[PDB]
Design a protein around this ligand. Structure first.
Ligand SMILES: Nc1ccn([C@@H]2O[C@H](COP(=O)(O)OP(=O)(O)OP(=O)(O)O)[C@@H](O)[C@H]2O)c(=O)n1
Ligand SMILES: Nc1ccn([C@@H]2O[C@H](COP(=O)(O)OP(=O)(O)OP(=O)(O)O)[C@@H](O)[C@H]2O)c(=O)n1
Ligand SMILES: [Zn+2]
Ligand SMILES: [Zn+2]
Lengths: 293, 148, 293, 148, 293, 293
């Protein structure tokens, strides 16, 4: 049974399908949802701040009848902090700048720990949200052709997405990044489905069902010139959008800065706003599997 | 060059110069007698080191940690002067404590209670993986961590 | 009757015993605790941030049916701020960097003010937690032998502890600090029980029932060398622990940094984790005496 | 418990557990044979350590550095199997390299080429003085630096 | 013969008397002083800035026909820096934040190194200036009664002064400081003349021939209150000045902040301005002993 | 004739040989060197600070009878600044953070401009110093085997060295760097002699006559781990030194940090200290060709 949510690997195909169904139920926002967190306190421990993900979980918990305590920002030990939250609460949702922080927390902790981001490692509940969105659109995840675009090296969401896909059967996952930001050999060796590294999206854009973008950041390249020379071709432009198949979708776990042309918003292919809107019901679902079964 | 031991463990066939690292690997550096000889002759290896720990029988677990720096080594358990056991050294599945994670952002590199932990990924060319952050280390990084 | 909680002196021996009993009751965490703060709003005004103490009070209030508003961090007057909280709330829990801030607040305020720390002055609800822990362990506070270890000059918790002990009859309180961090003459003259200043813990460690540690900080000594020369002997080490009597306890109001050797955690003498776990029920108790009687 | 040595130095009567520190003190940790026994019986000391270094004769200078952590120690120079010399250990006048200066502002604490240097001020209660900044260290600070 | 000037101990009584005579000569500022540094380049390496001492040496060197190169302020090695100055110059005058920097420099260097200040260690040419001033006034240094006032722990000038006095026969040196800023046992054990530690100057002010003041700084005490309570009695006030003997002098190696009442300036006892005015000729003298004999 | 010194390309083979001879003359430091800068003022305009190179030029100018004005550090135009120096002086030696700053300056300026470093572009007088050192040791530059080790992408000294070598006939220049810090295609296409890019020095160390090292810096790589994994093999270690031919030399334009093991200093192969010691006479020489012919 689900307890700690630390890796996308924590989920089986069975648990995901269950979660999709519960998400469908919680989406059609009836006013009689079962208050499975009634009399329970979840702590939201965002050592590394993120207000979008903070609020998503809080709303999820509120919808389920839970009370919320937490903190955002700011030499005490992670271990000691985790022991403290165990006095105060019945589950912890944490985001942290150090890789493996959630795994370690879950080892110290008696109450469930949910990883809302650990360094550049994983963001497993995002991956659940991502594939729920895809599964909603295509009525399948199996057999789809994916393209990951942008930074594929330092993006926990990419990591969590690649790993969660291994519970399914994708036809192909294209990995479109500059040379510098390629998925780590380590991660690719875990995978059990066809992958193909490519540098320019226009070469394959016509094939993809799902285009998933992440931001590339200047403060990463050898010098500022390389970035400037490379950046313009990992932007989702209106032209790139128009070259996609009719039934294709564009995803992005927010926030965006400038990596998506805002004109894309108005095309029917843009799915990133719908993606963010499932954040709450999906996380309601995950919480329901942890505490309500 | 060191006398025989009444009861305990003899770790023979350590590469020359590496005995000190073997003891570190074992956490030994109190109460019980220890003998080392360093840089002694070895017919099969040219030079070797030998470690002898009285009154302690190293487990297969403790022993496998030695293979990281002394895969040639042979472990003899000694009782009443008779060698009662000659352990088969294997590459350990998990290494907790001995090796640090090169990722400065790894939780194990920041929280004192977060003890570094590596799971062997392949024995073949030796590659180990940090269980927290998934960073991979090779035999080089491993040996340069323990030997220097 | 209890109203403002500003000093450990606010409590009588009678009120403390009552609080211990209520704490015992709230500890055995029944799901039918009386919601004495129902329809009431407590504001948590942490001008000086502390997340551990923030969350402790919030949980206490939540458990009692109260609503929580508050702030942590950040040229308005303390007085004006206190007047504002009186519009918004039915009690204030404040922590502030200025000594006497709680006393002054309680003079401006109609609603109860609870001091969760005022400069280097006091931390009275911590002292209640400290002695509750001791009383739980030994079934008494009278007749015990104490040792305060670390910084005894600038530690509000030490101050509050020394003052609260005067409602009891300790056999002896050892004051173990470097010369620089001795309890202030002012404070020691208030006391009504034997005290003895000493510099090295190993001289008396065999006698103490309760060892209470605080951190010494570099940014205090004449130069960085003095600190480095003195610091290693106010650390609670495994050796010091092993030299304590079988039935003795080690306390520390968290967070710790490095002043306790983490191996101590595993000995049965370590009581600082249990100490933190009474934070909520004790503060529930104090709130119950203020609003529920 | 270790065999006799054909040629070299035997450092006997080291306090129990301190042999490793003696080698550090000497800069030894390559080529030549070394033997240690640790925690062996000693009639006069209860327990002791013995170090044996083949093919090297420790000088009175090198030897006096040992007195910092093993003032009881006895140094034997061995040739053709015969002990040809039994050195009188003395408190060394100057200590270069082994001890660091506790003053964070000392030049020796900042410049890699500025090698820490202490001059013995009194042997009686042992006090040493940093030659650059005049900071004084006692036997405690000395032993806690080398032993741990 | 004089070469490296690293400690006040580098000088013998004989060399000092010689230096005083040369200073007398260079003081009566004739326009035919011998250009002993003609064709020579001295580098002024002030790793730790001081403009007063920088300019003093530069002027000294200029007066002697030398060329000046140097730097003030701003991961290269001290050793490497010293090797570089040896390419460029025929002597080095350095000031550095690390104790023993001059001693080490002089070990790396072939050319003479002159210590213009090394951490909190020494300032030996200041001590020469100090005693020259005293010897000028009293026609003796032997048999005088001194009082050092202010910070006697972290003041290189005090250190250098105490050590240089050991080439003479002072009747007594009073050490007037707060408890915290007492001369280091280490330094006092070197001395070969009567010393006496005292806390208040008015107790002995009537006896002193030479009153030598240094500044006490806040950023040193246990807390800001102690400083404020202690500071006002290590100030040279008009009252303290008026209590000195008719023929007594007040010295201070500049800059001052507020440790001397500015009204003292107008009394005939004030000698700190005359003291600074010998800086050049004294340093001319020292240079003359190093290069002109 | 030589005037502006902006690129290593400004020098012909003939001018270099002439400069070597003049350097030989100025090295044997006779006290009758011709004061070719007498009555002339050179300004040293170090917009980007470097004290080593500042002092080198200043000493050069002093040795030649020139007066020195200048500045180091600190929205005025470069052009306007150059116009100002033309009022004040008869030549400019500048170092600047912007590539091409010296070229532009020399276009605005009537008086000679000498490039002492322009961004990551060139450091042409260093290259003269480098090859003078090599030519002194081997009595030739033609036919030698070189190895450049460290950062070969962002090192103006490497750039200037590679370009100056094209006036000669090197047998081979090995380019040993991590993949990231390879000499720029642009620069390599200028060259007229065999070059060979390699990643590990031990592969070819046995062949090199001249080993020239530059520092690799963390703040350049994809992440801090890559640097840490790569850095230890571009360090000149004692082992690498011992593997060099008997008559081989190790050069480095200072400062060093940790890229050379300090034990190398004591081997006869270490030539970087001798290299720095020719800085003055070489720059004297260059100045002599600009103003004394
Ligand atoms: N009572 C004993 C028995 C043996 N040994 C040591 O432990 C090893 C014992 O192995 P053993 O079977 O006795 O000799 P070998 O057969 O030669 O060992 P191997 O075949 O592994 O080389 C030898 O190094 C010996 O010095 C010991 O110290 N005390
Ligand atoms: N050829 C030799 C000679 C002796 N030893 C060792 O070095 C010391 C020799 O001292 P020795 O004079 O032979 O024995 P003791 O007289 O007992 O030594 P001491 O009086 O100093 O205790 C002993 O520990 C012995 O084991 C050795 O290893 N090889
Ligand atoms: Zn890791
Ligand atoms: Zn020192």
């Amino acid at each position: 049974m689900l307890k700690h949510i630390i890796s996308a690997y924590n989920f089986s195909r069975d648990e995901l399908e269950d979660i999709f169904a519960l998400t469908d139920k919680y989406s059609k926002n009836l006013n009689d949802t079962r208050k499975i967190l009634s009399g329970k306190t979840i702590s939201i421990a965002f050592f590394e701040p993120s207000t979008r993900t903070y609020l998503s979980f809080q709303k999820a918990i509120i919808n389920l009848g839970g009370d919320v305590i937490g903190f955002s920002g700011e030499g005490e030990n992670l271990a000691d902090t985790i022991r403290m939250l165990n006095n105060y609460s019945d589950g912890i949702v944490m985001r942290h700048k150090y890789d493996g922080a959630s795994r370690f927390a879950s080892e110290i902790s008696d109450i469930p720990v949910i990883n809302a981001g650990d360094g550049k490692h994983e963001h497993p509940t995002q991956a659940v949200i991502d594939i729920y969105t895809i599964n909603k659109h295509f009525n399948t995840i199996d057999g789809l052709v994916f393209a990951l675009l942008g930074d594929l090296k330092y993006a926990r969401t990419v990591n969590s997405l690649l790993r969660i896909l291994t519970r399914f059967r994708p036809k192909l996952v294209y990995l479109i990044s500059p040379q510098l930001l390629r998925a780590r050999k380590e991660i690719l060796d875990e995978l059990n489905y066809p992958v193909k590294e490519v540098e320019n999206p226009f070469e394959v854009i016509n094939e993809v069902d799902v285009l998933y973008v992440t931001r590339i950041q200047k403060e990463r390249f050898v010098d500022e010139m390389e970035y400037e020379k490379i950046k313009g071709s990992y932007i989702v432009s209106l032209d790139l959008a128009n070259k996609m198949k009719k039934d294709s979708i564009i995803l992005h776990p927010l926030p965006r800065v400038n990596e998506i042309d805002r004109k894309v918003d108005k095309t029917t292919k843009a799915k990133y706003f719908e993606q963010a809107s499932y954040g709450v019901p999906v996380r309601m679902s995950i919480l329901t599997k942890i505490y309500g079964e | 060059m060191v006398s025989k031991i009444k009861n305990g463990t003899v770790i023979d066939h350590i590469p020359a110069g590496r005995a000190f690292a073997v003891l570190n690997v074992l956490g030994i550096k109190e109460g019980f007698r220890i003998a080392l000889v360093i840089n002694v002759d070895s017919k099969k290896m040219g030079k070797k080191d030998i470690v002898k720990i009285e009154d302690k029988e190293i487990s297969d677990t403790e022993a496998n940690l030695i293979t990281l720096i002394a895969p040639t080594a042979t472990i003899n358990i000694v009782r009443e002067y008779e060698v009662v056991k000659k352990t088969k050294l294997e590459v350990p599945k998990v290494v907790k404590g001995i090796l640090k994670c090169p990722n400065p952002y790894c939780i194990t590199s920041n929280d004192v209670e977060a003890i570094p932990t590596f799971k062997t990924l392949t024995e073949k060319p030796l590659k180990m993986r940090c269980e927290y952050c998934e960073t991979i280390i090779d035999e080089n990084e491993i040996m340069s961590q323990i030997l220097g």
